[PDB]
Design a protein around this ligand. Structure first.
Ligand SMILES: Nc1ncnc2c1ncn2[C@@H]1O[C@H](COP(=O)(O)OP(=O)(O)OP(=O)(O)O)[C@@H](O)[C@H]1O
Lengths: 51, 502, 481, 72, 247, 245, 72
């Protein structure tokens, strides 16, 4: 019982920690997506004119 | 440009009638291509770079970029009801604004026009928009404190008059309650505040100006308000005109407090105003000029030395971190532009702490130099206490422990952090917050409930001043928390512990 | 206005650049109609709006109908004012596209009173000071996350989850309780779902097949067939068709916009068509100013509130990117409709926990309302926590201290489900309207603990607390048999 | 195959024809739908169709938006 | 590319013989088009290629069809730039290409050459009526086992190899043996491996995969399957390896 | 930037002194270039900057060279925008600079000032003939310790610290002690907070790092080295910490 | 050092020279490659050559491509 409860509190700590990690990684992925798409659009529009 | 703007048929007729003939148009120009809020004008050669040109309907236009023929201006009003072929006229004043001490209480629409409607404010102009920021010799190190009112801010992240200090946060987590609390606490000591709201849904700024009106701060404050439904150039100009309208009172030897609201929305108005110009953008499509923008805006808010009169303007800009990411573009920009950061975290405000200030990230570069000689010792002790508690809570000791917290520091740290929460728009005076800081600092009150430390300290606050004006006099005259003040405060809080027990 | 005879010089896609004589040019956002011609032989006119002046007397204008077949040089005629939308009591019941012609084919609308699309903002002498919340008529909304009267509201939930029955109930309740009147203004509404909504409206009695101008909706449908100019200006059309309502009758008007992100998408299309350099992720440069002009005319003026409810479809589900960011800068109450709750059948499927409102605070609602609301949310949080563990331990195994919390949370989640005034057509349940006072007292009675012995299903699909106790004693009377 | 018009467009067909194929099949199924017959039009690779529109519009000098797809 | 196409089209129009053309780095036929299109005044498309990516790529890759006088089998070696699987220059070639074989840098990382992805390398010829029912069922079981391994990669990576299921541990060992066994010692790559090249037909490797994934010979060591021509060669390699282990 | 450079160049090239010029925020020079060359008509470049972001800043960096007359020990607080080194305006700075130290925001978020990242901060002078073999070997060892810490950061992610075996746990404890010890109460940050400044010489920090990396100071907890100077003072701080309890 | 030419190009060079430096080195080694000697060229920061060529071909208004690099 004590071993399985140690494994269970490890699982609870790991699940909450992976929840924090998923939130922070989603934030990083969102700012990365916005940066990628914005850089793409700036490439396209700035190369459009070429005056 | 192959399609040059000064090549309309009607306009080039005017030049083609006289090749090398009778003299040019001195101050009469025909508007043309008045589209994306950026009119262009033929002729008008008298215009100074930065001159303030006028139109027929009565709308005002800054003349930024005059090319070879077209003196391209940035019309400040809405460019809707202007038609092509209309005449314009400059007035020979370089982007001026009429400003006076009649503005205290009004609601300006960023063109020195009152938007409350109840009267037209008179003034002696004397003030430009893009004036030079005070020189390096004119400025003096920040020494006088600012009673921000919020316990957390004025305890650990001190704001000093003359020290710009952004309150960066997240959407729908304070920053306007925090800004209006700073303005509201400035009731007693005279400062000519300027609450310049850039990006605010008009109901929010109407609610804020009404809250000012009813709680009395309208005797001094100035709400330079610009709705979210306003032409982008007005949302761009409103903080500059707020800075000029507060700088008029800064130059004449009087402390001021300006608060730019939603300075990220201002940079958003500028990226709009520039991507309409099709000038090339940078990261997150900001045109790169946002730094020089927030430079002209935020470097003209600091304390002038005794030579020009000991005046001051704390700046308290509010950059709204829409992402929750401190490492976005414009929050990083304003953090580099300002003397510190007061981070209003989102998760804490969702968790309950009503001034969501977390002292882990929020630092003040002016530091303990700007605090009072009274509060400095106890606030240093409190900051170290919060460091200890933050470690002991964020980290281990959930199992009982070797060191066995909740019996050394965890209970008192929880009591302190739940003491740091203020009620909504109820600022604490200087002596009140000094005593409140002292209470949990040295560990006087540790065996109450952590549930209602606030609900005890409301009684303590109401009691201490009515019982012992000796404390208020000590803090008000000498400005130093004496050992005698410590003793009389001990006796006062003892008698209040009695009255609370019964 | 006048025969401002112009040539349609350039036609790129939807955008049609028109010219004019040098003197008289319509100002920006001034609607001009072309005297166009259909290839089938009908002189069909497609209406246009001047979005950007281009200097040489030529005003670049987008088209509120298809430009397929528009001859260059076809006579274009100015109107001198923005798109005259036929506001009034006449436009109460029928379906309108952006220029304001009834497309349901019933009959022509009386154009007696017409305000332009682009009426400007109301000033601070017009806007109201006191921040009164909006007693909608759903117990979940008016307890846990109140809607701000005069403010914005966001329905993050998907479609099919119950958005249509929710908005139908809201429209019927606004017609019933207040003197109000609703204006559904679906922007970019997919015409299949638009007809679905219209037929559900007609079958709910919310609007009457037989009685128009006594109905309770002013449907403005931005189809997706129309060019991006039209399904962008449909938002402003709904705005002014409800603004005339509030500023002539002084009544609490509702304004349902379909997804603001669809409006912002239409704005992105129209700006990319105008060729102005796109901003961050790809929405237009004038994104904040455009959608602020859309959503700032939604304010409680001193005549009467125009409180609106705006669906929001975040793309890839992140509130960070600009369009949901510049929307959530405006929104005053956000209530998500939950698919799991809908599949359970807790109609309305509004998530009690994740739905938040900036108006919940005590100085706004009342100290008792804020206290009971915070305690209900903490109880539902306790239940979402212990839903993990009652799967393993069971209700009697864990502590009886918070087994009462689990039981009261069951009673709360059941008490939240309100039988609507529209669900009668699906089931025949008569439906109960619940003001704030009744749900406040009932939730205090449930959460305090007086009703610890009432069965859970006596709280499901019931209105007030007295009716819930009536259902409980009904089950008790049948318990003998 | 008795009842299914397979509007084929090979890849070497020019940009206009790959752009027009969904519209062509829509105009066939639209006729069959208007004369009471239930139809079912199955497009293939709208990614490829809007990509061909992207090609023809970027050639035609129309200003591009996100992902260089044109305005409309 | 069009010169090679004209040679093949002559060999398919006139000689009527099934000519096998090889194009390598067909992505260069789009990159050069980009480098000239940017200059040509044509506006830039997505991430930086030409606007007429689809039409030009199709104008090449459509001429390669068996046209009732012969059959031009062609093997283009697309260059997925920087492993951008979503890049338009391979994304429009995936539409034209029948038997795509997506080689993956992540599988050359662990040395498994050729680093063809067992999952993503898919073909329009893995239908049973076309390939054989036994071939189809064994390919289905191999690909499902590799998909299971990819889905258990994260569980293996963090939570310890042993803490997953015991039957799923059998599946992981089987997947490891499979993704090593599908490595070939090439004749032209004998210089990089040092081992002599071995040619194996379809039948021998089919019978090898059967007994490998069937769990019947799940006792050999893993390195006895890696860089091995055939299943009997693997069995002999296990003998050699276990002998030199103790000795 | 150019006028600072010329002012220092006259005192180096002519009057022959060991001039120091602390050009502050040399990124702002490149950003000013971005402003002007967006308005000058010159075509835009990588993400926003001028096309000549590697020749104008080249002209700024290349004139700061230690000539045969004198040497210019220049410090340039170049400012990465939005906290990513891959930006071109500090990327072209990395190529020119030779004692690059990257002040990551992570260490200042954790509270460890100065926030000099210990992995990323490198030098051309970390060489055997230049600094002696002992300094070199200690630098290599502490870099190894911190690198292994940052490489199993992905494991003291989702799982816990206790998942590690004994050697991993010991190198993590050593890395925590080192990463804490790399903080110092500055002599000019006395205004913000912290103790008065402790000047630390190389001969004193090298001994403390020998001590920590020799494992001999395992009895001390991590908070001993946090914001301390010399290691004898660190041990004294730990003794007073246990006295105060 | 008696055998190792060093084509050295500073940062202060006009960006033509940082574009010509590796070509200068390549041709100076090409002479030895036609003189049978197994010569060896080592470029340093070949990112900097393409960066200076980006500087050039963006100061010539020749249109850029991916990562704002010029075409060829
Ligand atoms: N310290 C506080 N205690 C209680 N309520 C608060 C507090 N701070 C803010 N609020 C609530 O928040 C609302 C005001 O919004 P808030 O100031 O949080 O964000 P905001 O500044 O309006 O957002 P933005 O920065 O986008 O303008 C008020 O209704 C108020 O009740």
């Amino acid at each position: 019982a004590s071993e399985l409860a140690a494994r269970m509190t490890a699982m609870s700590n790991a699940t909450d920690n992976a929840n924090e990690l998923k939130k922070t990684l989603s934030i990083n992925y969102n700012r990365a997506r916005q940066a990628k798409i914005t850089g793409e659009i700036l490439e396209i529009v700035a190369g459009a004119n070429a005056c | 440009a192959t399609i040059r703007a000064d090549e309309i048929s009607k306009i080039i007729r005017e030049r083609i009638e006289g090749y090398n003939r009778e003299v040019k148009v001195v101050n009469t120009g025909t508007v043309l291509q008045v589209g994306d809020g950026i009119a262009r004008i033929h002729g008008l050669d008298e215009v100074m770079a930065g001159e303030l040109v006028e139109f027929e309907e009565g709308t005002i236009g800054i003349a930024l970029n005059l090319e070879s023929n077209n003196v391209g201006v940035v019309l400040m009003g809405d460019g809707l009801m202007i038609q092509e072929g209309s005449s314009v006229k400059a007035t020979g004043r370089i982007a001026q604004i009429p400003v006076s001490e009649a503005y205290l209480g009004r609601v300006i629409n960023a063109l020195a026009k009152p938007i409350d409607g109840r009267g037209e404010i008179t003034a002696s102009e004397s003030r430009l928009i893009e004036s030079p920021a005070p020189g390096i010799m004119s400025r003096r190190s920040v020494y006088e404190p600012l009673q921000t009112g919020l316990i957390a801010i004025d305890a650990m992240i001190p704001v000093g008059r003359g020290q710009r200090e952004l309150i960066i946060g997240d959407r729908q987590t304070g920053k306007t309650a925090v800004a209006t609390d700073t303005i509201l606490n400035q009731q007693g000591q005279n400062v000519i505040c300027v609450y310049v709201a850039i990006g605010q849904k008009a109901s929010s700024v109407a609610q804020v100006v009404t809250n000012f009106q009813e709680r009395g701060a309208m005797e001094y404050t100035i709400v330079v308000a610009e709705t979210a439904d306003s032409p982008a150039t007005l949302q761009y100009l409103a903080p500059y005109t707020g800075a000029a309208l507060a700088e008029y009172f800064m130059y004449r030897e009087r402390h001021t407090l300006i608060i730019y609201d939603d300075l990220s929305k201002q940079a958003q108005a500028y990226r709009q105003m520039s991507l309409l110009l099709r000038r090339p953008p940078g990261r997150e499509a900001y045109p790169g000029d946002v730094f020089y923008l927030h430079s002209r805006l935020l470097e003209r808010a600091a304390k002038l030395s005794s030579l020009l009169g000991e005046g001051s303007m704390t700046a308290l800009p509010i950059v709204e971190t829409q992402a929750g990411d401190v490492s976005a573009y414009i929050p990083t920009n304003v953090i580099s532009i300002t003397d510190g950061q007061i981070f209003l975290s989102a998760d804490l405000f969702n968790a309950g702490i009503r001034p969501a200030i977390n002292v882990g990230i929020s630092v003040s570069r002016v530091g303990s130099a700007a605090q009072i000689k009274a509060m400095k010792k106890v606030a240093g002790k409190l900051k170290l206490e919060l460091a200890q508690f933050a470690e002991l809570e964020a980290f281990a000791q959930f199992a009982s422990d070797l060191d066995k917290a909740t019996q050394n520091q965890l209970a008192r740290g929880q009591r302190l952090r739940e003491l740091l929460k203020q009620p909504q728009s109820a600022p604490l005076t200087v002596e009140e917050q000094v005593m409140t800081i002292y209470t949990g600092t040295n560990g006087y009150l540790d065996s109450l409930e952590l549930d209602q430390v606030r609900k005890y300290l409301v009684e303590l606050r109401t009691y201490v001043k009515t019982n012992k004006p000796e404390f208020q006099e000590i803090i008000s005259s000498t400005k130093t928390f004496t050992e005698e003040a410590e003793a009389l405060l001990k006796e006062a809080i003892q008698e209040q512990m009695e009255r609370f027990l019964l | 206005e006048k025969k401002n005879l112009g040539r349609i010089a350039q036609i790129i896609g939807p955008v049609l650049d028109v010219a004019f004589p040098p003197g008289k040019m319509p100002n920006i956002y001034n609607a001009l109609i072309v005297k166009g011609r259909d290839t089938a032989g009908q002189p069909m006119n497609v209406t246009c709006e001047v979005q950007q002046l281009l200097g040489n007397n030529r005003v670049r204008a987008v088209a509120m109908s298809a430009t397929d077949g528009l001859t260059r040089g076809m006579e274009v005629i100015d109107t001198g004012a923005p798109l005259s939308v036929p506001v009034g009591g006449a436009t109460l019941g029928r379906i309108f596209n952006v220029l304001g012609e009834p497309v349901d084919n019933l009959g022509p609308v009386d154009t007696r009173t017409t305000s332009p699309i682009h009426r400007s903002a109301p000033a601070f002498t017009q806007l109201d000071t006191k921040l009164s919340i909006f007693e909608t008529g759903i117990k979940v909304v008016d307890l846990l996350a109140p809607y701000r009267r005069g403010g914005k509201i966001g329905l993050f939930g998907g479609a099919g989850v119950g958005k249509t029955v929710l908005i139908m109930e809201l429209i019927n309740n606004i017609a019933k309780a207040h003197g109000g009147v609703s204006v559904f203004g679906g922007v970019g509404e997919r015409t299949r779902e638009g007809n679905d909504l219209y037929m559900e409206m007609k079958e709910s009695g919310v609007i009457n097949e037989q009685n128009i101008a006594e109905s309770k909706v002013a449907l403005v449908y931005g189809q997706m067939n129309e060019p991006p100019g039209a399904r962008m200006r449909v938002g402003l059309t709904a705005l002014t068709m409800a603004e005339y309502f509030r500023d002539v009758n002084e009544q609490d008007v509702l304004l349902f916009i379909d997804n603001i992100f669809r409006f912002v998408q239409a704005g992105s299309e129209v700006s990319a068509l105008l060729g102005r350099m796109p901003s961050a992720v790809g929405y237009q440069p004038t994104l904040s100013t455009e959608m602020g002009s859309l959503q700032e005319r939604i304010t409680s003026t001193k005549e009467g509130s125009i409180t609106s409810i705006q669906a929001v479809y975040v793309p890839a589900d992140d509130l960070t990117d600009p369009a949901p960011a510049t929307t959530f800068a405006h929104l005053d109450a956000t209530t998500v409709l939950s698919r799991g709750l809908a599949a359970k059948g807790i109609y309305p499927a509004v998530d009690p926990l994740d739905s938040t409102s900036t108006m919940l605070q005590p100085r706004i609602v009342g100290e008792e309302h804020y206290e009971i609301a915070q305690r209900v949310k903490e109880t539902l949080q306790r239940y979402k926590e212990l839903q993990d563990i009652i799967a393993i331990l069971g209700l009697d195994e864990l502590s009886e201290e918070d087994r009462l919390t689990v039981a009261r949370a069951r009673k709360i989640e059941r008490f939240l489900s309100q039988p609507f005034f529209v669900a009668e057509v699906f089931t025949g349940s008569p439906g109960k309207y619940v003001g704030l006072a009744e749900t406040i007292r009932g939730f205090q009675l449930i959460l305090s603990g007086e009703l610890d012995s009432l069965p859970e299903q006596a709280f499901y699909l019931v209105g007030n607390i007295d009716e819930a106790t009536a259902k409980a004693m009904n089950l008790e009377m049948e318990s003998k048999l």
